[PDB]
Design an enzyme around this catalytic site. Structure first.
Site, mmCIF file in Angstrom:
data_model
loop_
_atom_site.group_PDB
_atom_site.id
_atom_site.type_symbol
_atom_site.label_atom_id
_atom_site.label_comp_id
_atom_site.label_asym_id
_atom_site.label_seq_id
_atom_site.Cartn_x
_atom_site.Cartn_y
_atom_site.Cartn_z
ATOM 1 C CD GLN A 1 40.075 39.880 40.919
ATOM 2 O OE1 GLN A 1 40.482 40.493 41.902
ATOM 3 N NE2 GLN A 1 38.834 39.434 40.827
ATOM 4 C CD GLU A 2 47.524 38.562 42.369
ATOM 5 O OE1 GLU A 2 48.343 37.620 42.327
ATOM 6 O OE2 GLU A 2 47.846 39.721 42.718
ATOM 7 C CG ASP A 3 49.742 36.283 37.255
ATOM 8 O OD1 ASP A 3 49.751 37.201 36.405
ATOM 9 O OD2 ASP A 3 50.520 36.242 38.231
ATOM 10 C CB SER A 4 43.720 32.419 37.373
ATOM 11 O OG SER A 4 42.991 33.389 38.107
#
Ligand SMILES: [Mg+2]
Ligand SMILES: [Mg+2]
Ligand SMILES: [Zn+2]
Ligand SMILES: [Zn+2]
Lengths: 189, 49, 65, 49, 56, 168, 38, 98
Positions: free
Chosen positions: B2-5
């Site tokens: 999630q969130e760019d990872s």
DNA sequence: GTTGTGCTATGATATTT
RNA sequence: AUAUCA
DNA sequence: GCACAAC
């Protein structure tokens, strides 16, 4: 330092720099807590900051072996500067200026090395050889342009910079037998 | 992821994926401080150092 | 930098198929898709493995000492 | 079991950038200090705060 | 740290690997994305100072 | 104010000399030694002083004295402030201007903005964050490596005395 | 007004691959022996 | 007519490695020229035989260029404050494209 | 009317004399 | 001091 | 380079 609890003659102690402590390796007692980084601390004296923006850069390195301890800044142009006050404050430094003038014989060694294509380590040995033998009674009254011509081969013979005596005869000057005797009375000192 | 990872196939990693070589180079001089003082390359002994 | 042994994603041994590949493109003069198929690289994870490999080791060999 | 949704799947060229975590992670409970201000030193590599 | 929700008192879970791990819903006030962002941890040293964290 | 701040003290007659802590020295390797810019600037003040003292004592040539006075004036002035409008900066051999006292307090990274109002600290850590849907809201994942470095000084009472002895 | 050589002046750094650089007229195999990358 | 565009790329120039060295060499050669003159006075006063090696200081131009290229302050070291820094950086060798 | 005087984002990291 | 990181 | 402050 020696551990107050143990006391063994070879005092085995470690410098745990990473935790900033000085420990006794045997009992583990911490002997000091304030510990300073000498590398970064030395970065404050000799830096790469020539512009003047670094707030860490706050001092300057000097050479107590060669020029003694002569701390002295120079009046120069800054960002907001009138070219008038620079001249006056510099013309005022002229009235404030014998052996404190024989340091210009370092300028004779520096201008000789640069004319002989010699490294920065050779000049500083020639300047230390000249400072420790120019006021000697063992040299007494030798040709004053042939005792600094001999202290350049003394500085080259330690810095491993190959320079024959005939190579320095070409620079200045040298009277051969005159700067050959002078290259020996100093060699004893 | 999630969130760019993001998730990465740990098995693929083992088989060579995105590994890299790394080389750092440390330098040191044996400086000469005037007429007498000279640094030295040697194994220091803890009693006299 | 040398044909990798084994495909990353799936793990088929792919490192033995290099010299055999370059033979198909040079000696037999097959085009790549055909060559890769002849080798037995069925799924695209294994195809990219050989199709994309750059043999730098051959460049490194050119330096003498 | 099947996923109820279908997934976009395929090769994409991906770059391994600098900045690896073990080159950044940094902790320090007391350590070297500046000589002037007596506060901690600056820098992961100086083991500062 | 632009507002007070950029510093919040958390509860340590010791885990492996070299990253700070945080719950996603807490991303919004730290304004953190996980594109290589780093964060700061401070450990209170007093029994009194941890009470200020935990209670406030 | 009659006690703390009289007009006549705006003019310097005696100069407080700060101790080494304010202007540290470093002794490197017997041919390398580093003095603080203030120690330099002071030595100039002194030299300029010793000079003007000798001039007044001797046959005062009026205009050669006021010439040496406005040199002293400069060194003392430039020591507290080197960024003076109109005046030339005092420079330090390498071409860099002397770090005056004013300039140490002044900017962000000054003594105020950067050593008092904010300062680096111990018992702190920093690293890359990543997301975890299996943590609680109020938790935080701490790498074992960091947890082993950071410390909390718990005090021995008879409650934790057993537990702490095991930790030690 | 009646009337009564070649001197070294300094060392100038060369830019690699320029006319004055050794590597300018260098072939591929040449560079490799010189431990440079073509 | 309308006011000239101060941003028009045609009315701009790029000072590359050539002209940069030319700018530096000028101020470095006039530094040498006027140090030889200071010598011709010193050696006509005492008729000390105008020795060439003593006259021309090689280190002037050699280390004068070495300084600029190294540090990056495009000027003398005097002068290292009033001189523009940024010219001459250490070359990137991360990836061939970098 | 002109001059002249303060400041101009947070932290982090890596080299170069 | 330049480069860079969010 | 602002923008506002005093000569
Ligand atoms: Mg972000
Ligand atoms: Mg976000
Ligand atoms: Zn002990
Ligand atoms: Zn595969």
């Amino acid at each position: 330092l020696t551990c107050p609890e143990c006391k063994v003659y070879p005092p085995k102690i470690v410098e745990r720099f990473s935790e900033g402590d000085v420990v006794c390796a045997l009992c583990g007692l911490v002997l000091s807590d304030k510990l300073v980084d000498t590398r970064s601390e030395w970065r404050t004296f000799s830096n790469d900051d020539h512009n003047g923006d670094d707030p860490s850069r706050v001092g300057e390195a000097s050479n107590p072996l060669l020029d003694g301890n002569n701390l002295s800044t120079r009046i120069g142009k800054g960002e907001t500067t009138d070219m008038r006050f620079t001249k006056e404050l510099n013309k005022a430094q002229g009235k404030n200026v014998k052996d404190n003038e024989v340091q210009a014989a370092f300028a004779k060694i520096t201008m000789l090395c640069d004319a002989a294509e010699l490294p920065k380590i050779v000049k500083d040995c020639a300047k230390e050889a000249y400072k420790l033998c120019h006021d000697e009674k063992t040299l007494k009254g030798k040709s004053m342009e042939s005792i600094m011509a001999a202290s350049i081969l003394i500085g080259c013979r330690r810095a491993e910079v190959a320079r024959t005596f005939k190579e320095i005869q070409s620079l200045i000057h040298v009277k051969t037998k005159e700067f050959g005797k002078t290259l020996n009375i100093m060699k004893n000192i | 992821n999630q969130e760019d990872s993001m998730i990465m196939n740990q098995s693929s990693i083992d088989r060579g994926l995105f590994r890299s070589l790394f080389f750092r180079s440390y330098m040191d001089q044996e400086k000469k401080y005037g007429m007498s003082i000279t640094e030295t390359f040697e194994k220091p002994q803890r009693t006299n150092t | 930098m040398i044909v990798p042994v084994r495909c990353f994603s799936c793990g088929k041994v792919v490192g033995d198929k290099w010299e055999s590949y370059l033979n198909l493109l040079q000696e037999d003069e097959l085009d790549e898709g055909t060559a890769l198929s002849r080798l037995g690289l069925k799924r695209y994870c294994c195809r990219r493995m050989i199709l994309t490999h750059v043999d730098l080791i051959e460049k490194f060999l050119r330096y003498n000492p | 079991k099947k996923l109820m949704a279908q997934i976009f799947f395929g090769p994409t060229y991906y770059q391994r950038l600098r900045h690896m975590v073990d080159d950044k992670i940094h902790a320090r409970a007391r350590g070297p200090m500046q000589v002037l201000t007596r506060q901690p030193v600056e820098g992961r590599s100086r083991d500062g705060g | 740290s632009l507002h007070k929700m950029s510093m919040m008192a958390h509860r340590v879970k010791v885990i492996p690997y070299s990253t700070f791990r945080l719950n996603l819903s807490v991303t919004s006030p730290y304004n953190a994305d996980f594109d290589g962002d780093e964060m700061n941890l401070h450990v209170p040293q007093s029994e009194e100072t941890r009470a200020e964290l935990s209670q406030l | 104010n009659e006690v703390f701040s009289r007009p006549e003290w705006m003019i310097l007659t005696c100069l407080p000399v700060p101790p080494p802590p304010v202007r540290p020295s470093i002794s490197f390797n017997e041919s390398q030694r580093g003095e603080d810019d203030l120690t330099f600037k002071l030595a100039d003040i002194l030299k300029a002083n010793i000079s003007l003292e000798t001039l007044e004592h001797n046959g005062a040539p009026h205009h050669a004295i006021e010439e040496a006075e406005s040199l002293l004036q400069f060194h003392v002035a430039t020591y507290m402030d080197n960024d003076i409008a109109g005046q030339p900066q005092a420079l330090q051999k390498s071409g860099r201007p002397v770090k005056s006292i004013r300039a140490r307090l002044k900017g962000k990274e000054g003594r105020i903005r950067g050593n008092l109002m904010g300062k680096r600290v111990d018992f702190s850590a920093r690293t890359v964050i990543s997301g975890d849907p299996n943590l609680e809201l109020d938790q935080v994942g701490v790498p074992k490596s960091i947890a082993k470095t950071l410390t909390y000084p718990e005090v021995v009472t008879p409650y934790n005395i057993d537990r702490l002895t095991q930790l030690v | 007004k009646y009337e009564l050589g070649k001197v070294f002046i300094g060392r100038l750094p060369i830019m690699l691959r320029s006319k004055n650089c050794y590597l300018s007229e260098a072939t591929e195999s040449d560079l490799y022996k010189l431990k440079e990358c073509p | 007519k309308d006011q000239d565009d101060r941003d028009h790329f045609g009315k701009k120039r790029l000072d590359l490695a050539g002209p940069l060295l030319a700018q530096l060499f000028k101020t470095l050669f006039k530094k040498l020229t006027k140090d030889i003159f200071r010598y011709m006075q010193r050696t006509v006063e005492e008729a000390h035989d105008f020795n060439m090696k003593l006259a021309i200081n090689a280190k002037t131009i050699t280390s004068g260029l070495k300084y600029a290229l190294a540090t990056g302050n495009w000027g003398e070291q005097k002068k290292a404050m009033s001189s523009r820094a940024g010219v001459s950086q250490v070359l990137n060798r991360y990836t061939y494209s970098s």
